[PDB]
Design a protein around this ligand. Sequence first.
Ligand SMILES: *[C@@H]1O[C@H](CO)[C@@H](O[C@@H]2O[C@H](CO)[C@@H](O)[C@H](O)[C@H]2NC(C)=O)[C@H](O)[C@H]1NC(C)=O
Ligand SMILES: *[C@@H]1O[C@H](CO)[C@@H](O[C@H]2O[C@H](CO)[C@@H](O)[C@H](O)[C@H]2NC(C)=O)[C@H](O)[C@H]1NC(C)=O
Ligand SMILES: *[C@H]1O[C@H](CO)[C@@H](O)[C@H](O)[C@H]1NC(C)=O
Length: 282
Amino acid sequence: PSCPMLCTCYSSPPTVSCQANNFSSVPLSLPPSTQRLFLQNNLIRSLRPGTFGPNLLTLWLFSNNLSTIYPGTFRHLQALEELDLGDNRHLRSLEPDTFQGLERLQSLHLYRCQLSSLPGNIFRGLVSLQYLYLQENSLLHLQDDLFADLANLSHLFLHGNRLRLLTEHVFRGLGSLDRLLLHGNRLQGVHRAAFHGLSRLTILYLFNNSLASLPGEALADLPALEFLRLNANPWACDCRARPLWAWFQRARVSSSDVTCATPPERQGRDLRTLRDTDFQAC
Ligand SMILES: *[C@@H]1O[C@H](CO)[C@@H](O[C@@H]2O[C@H](CO)[C@@H](O)[C@H](O)[C@H]2NC(C)=O)[C@H](O)[C@H]1NC(C)=O
Ligand SMILES: *[C@@H]1O[C@H](CO)[C@@H](O[C@H]2O[C@H](CO)[C@@H](O)[C@H](O)[C@H]2NC(C)=O)[C@H](O)[C@H]1NC(C)=O
Ligand SMILES: *[C@H]1O[C@H](CO)[C@@H](O)[C@H](O)[C@H]1NC(C)=O
């Protein structure tokens, strides 16, 4: 059985290229030796157990039409290092054990799949994961401990969702994280301890959200921070600004503008142009 129907196969490494055939299902008779499987740009609707072989290292399923990944689909892909399920606009939800088995996975792409929520334990056990792309879904909340096992995660992209709050332990377990992108949500509130333990984080984007203030304790929990983007938020330059203002007095970081939206008498000024005297009556 040497190459799946309408695909092209290569031997070093063992690769099966099945891109752009308008397939409705994953082709049959995948050689067990296959390490790279390229199924992007098809119209595949469902995935089931018994479809993928155990030697896969790379599996690209982006730009398909997936709506259901049945239980057990990925369970025996112990070796898998990269899984891209991005751009499946009707996917919508994932069952809680979808990634069980994938303890060697290093990159997981879930961008643009209409996810509105995730199971709280969906990323459990993904101890190898270094890159997780969840941008441009419709996510409304993230639970505490949603990433708690992801000790090696370096990039977490959550921009372009519908998040309103970051809770106390939403980022617990992310001790290796280097970049956290949360721009283009609707964030209104960040818990004072939401960034606790993010000791290696160097880049934080929070621009284009609905933040009127941010707690001073939270920036202080980012000792490694190098670049912060805070622009396109309705910053309140009243007594609420004092902790962020104070942090910026000491901070050595690159930053965007932090433009006051309110009160009218400070609208348009940068929050760093305020002086100690402006906060004396707080
Ligand atoms: C892409 O997947 C979507 C969602 O499963 C399909 O839209 C469903 O299509 C059937 C028509 O056969 C309807 O019963 C459902 O109302 C549709 N659901 C939604 C949410 O639109 C669509 O047919 C699929 N297209 C291809 C080419 O695979
Ligand atoms: C601010 O962020 C939002 C994402 O919430 C951006 O908005 C919308 O953004 C685009 C249209 O301008 C489209 O790509 C989307 O279909 C639409 N999405 C949502 C969820 O509303 C908006 O562009 C961002 N603004 C800037 C200047 O970056
Ligand atoms: C798949 O490929 C064609 C031709 O390039 C594309 O335009 C078409 O819409 C796709 N097929 C189906 C069945 O929709």
